[PDB]
Symmetry: D2
Subunit: 249 residues, 4 copies
């Protein structure tokens, strides 16, 4: 049971693999390579919402891969030092760009100097007297480093969402993921779609547009119900191609 995910050890992907469903781990260098692998009858963990995905949504649409589960990662950044450098000894920090913005206020509270690095790995490289790396919690410790502080990010409940993927359309599910594709351009296509679910009061937890026409990624809090089959009928009558790409709990 090969579990393909974005590596190396210590990424968000790996953290969510581990911290959630604690199973032979197979790290991949980026996501194209993890989707390919999954699409051998194996498993994959891979982000969809707000990561630090075109590719993912896209393979989901190709029917190369299907979503059987969800995992929501508590985004969290730590500060890693050289071993009892105390926080007040940190002169300078090193982190990738998206993480500097996640933690820009922390940098400021403390008036750290800072600059950028291609990797969290490279962040760890820079650690020395008066130098700390901002990286995800649970991640510096893969390579023997101990946080100076933790929950470092400016905003309190930032979350990334991860899908469990397979090459198996094998979906008692109580959340459903749909690709809804317009067969022609007209005004208000997204509106059509949202309104059809809202007829039936089917709450949509997540919705996404992707290509100047767009197709639609929607996720609904509800089981396979007769109401769901109705909105499907209506959408098809409205000219939407409808394929279910996820079903889970």
């Amino acid at each position: 049971m090969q579990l393909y995910y974005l590596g190396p050890k210590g990424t968000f992907s790996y953290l969510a693999c581990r911290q959630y469903f604690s199973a032979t781990f197979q790290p991949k260098s980026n996501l194209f390579e993890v989707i390919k692998a999954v699409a051998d009858t194996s498993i994959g963990v891979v982000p969809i919402e707000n990561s630090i995905i075109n590719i993912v949504a896209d393979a989901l649409a190709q029917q190369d891969v299907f979503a059987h589960g969800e995992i929501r990662l508590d985004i969290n950044f730590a500060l890693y030092g050289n071993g009892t450098d105390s926080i007040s000894d940190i002169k300078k920090v090193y982190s990738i760009a998206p993480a500097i913005s996640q933690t820009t206020n922390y940098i400021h509270q403390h008036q750290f100097d800072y600059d950028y690095v291609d990797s969290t790995i490279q962040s760890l490289t820079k650690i020395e007297n008066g130098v700390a790396a901002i990286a995800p919690l649970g991640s510096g410790e893969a390579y023997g480093f101990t946080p100076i502080d933790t929950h470092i990010e400016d905003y309190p409940h930032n979350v990334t969402r991860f899908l469990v993927i397979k090459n198996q359309q094998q979906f008692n599910a109580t959340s459903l993921m749909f690709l809804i594709t317009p067969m022609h351009d007209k005004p208000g296509l997204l509106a059509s779609v949202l309104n059809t679910f809202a007829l039936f009061n089917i709450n949509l937890s997540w919705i996404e547009s992707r290509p100047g026409m767009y197709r639609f990624f929607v996720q609904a809090d509800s089981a396979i119900t007769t109401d769901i089959k109705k909105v499907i009928a209506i959408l098809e009558t409205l000219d939407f191609k409808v394929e279910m790409i996820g079903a889970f709990n």
Copy 2:
């Protein structure tokens, strides 16, 4: 007139700077750094739709930066060789991961071996006898390289969209960009919004959700009109915070 954008010379950002509004160029290492700079009373070019942006949408929301123009880049990949290696001499190619997926069929038509590289710069490094780099057209030539072929991507009209940004809320505009933020959670908030514009038949060219609540990025094909002021009134009555973040032609 410092023009801040994502570098180095030969990125999509730079290409759109150049090919569109052909002006003192100031390349930046990534986008956080270009938004900061813009937010000195200067200019910025920066992508919003489908790039190969959390950060961008986010600064637009902070009112740190405002959009005064649009540029749509014809995505396009070329094949760069060592100088009359003909296409049939290419054994292997090197490119970043998102570009391999853009061109996966081209790789296959020709049965190239392939692997990944951190950069287009690094792609160019690998060029030798029997080795070619897949990179954006107009980009290998910044560093003296000539395409083996061009329009290499699998799908024909992929496009990225770029905003012209400023630290100036100084908006005769005929496209309008709004941040619409819900003051509370209830079902169908996005629906509310789309339906209000559709009352007035105001076509929305682009719409985006971002944070488990969401705020909304919408762009409307219409001027500052009395109808637009109406939908604004309605949205405020519905409890949406409304700020205009873009206005252009």
Copy 3:
């Protein structure tokens, strides 16, 4: 205090007045037609009137809806009347004896399956008391259930209506515009200023947004211009912030909105 309604005695209006009011807290004042009823309420400051508003079986509610639109009169309550009928005869006859019935037109129309099942011959009369005067051996009157006993007659048969849940809704009306004020249903007049496609949907979509039920929706033509309409709507809500929201939205959409009623 005056209670105007459509007479003569034994109409459905009259019955609604009996069901819903004491004779010893109102003086009953029958009028000849609905125009007169509304006119009397309009001019008598210590009056109410009871007037059909939904599912009349005789005569149009438009005249009532127009009085309300022009604010000649105001709605201060509603009452629902079951529309049921009986067969009234000579005290002797059984149903097997009846050869012929006489009835007002509205009553025939509601009891036609009845009339047919029984193969009665029939003819029309101008009023229920008229009906009653045709009674003799083998002749019956079809009348509002309980109207024959207002004149000293007895049914041969009752509950003879063809449908069981036919209900006419009446308004209790007054010439004063000041309403109960823990009101739990609201009536609005809503008038578009310009012609636009989908005006009614607009209105209904707005109330749905705040999940507020409409128990009644009526339209009437402007009459001052071809093609234009106004809307009558009754909402199950007290006057709340949600309600002020829909009015604001409707006004932004260029409808004028006015409360024409409020009660329980």
Copy 4:
């Protein structure tokens, strides 16, 4: 061929029949009430009937709407009649001479500002010919414009209605259900199977989706159950693919849909 309508001669129905038909392609058959009209059309296979459907000023359209719902009768066309009135007198009198008018109730209600401006005293009569019989020195009849000249009288004054664009819409009805077939407006009966909030909006929202205008929307109560309704809708469209789409959607939403009319 029979043309049933509400009499006697000189009603608005009668006038609509004159405006819209030859006497020499129909035999005119007045009936006493709308129930009789609909009943005659229902039983006469070579018949039409002309019957009010929108903006009646006298008497309810519900009976017509119910006949249509039960498919006793079918709509094969519509005609619009201007509702206008004249003052009819003794050939001698001028308006300055008139002390008193007599009129049917519906006519008083539409000419009341008129009556008031001129300070006529008035009273009611049961029909326009009755009106006409009250005429003498200082006494006039208010009647449908062109109905006095059906009996040999002349107006003292015309176009005396208080509003200029009051229009009653009539249906041309038949007991056969087979329609014109380059039809450009469609009438549907649409009935929900279950009670749900926002049923009417559902229907209207569905037609809007395909940008199809509704020129008329009416509701009627089920009557077999409390609380339930059916919907009458007239759509400006021929029978197209868009139309088949809305019906499919409506049926998916658990309405039954049936064509009750189709014409131009």
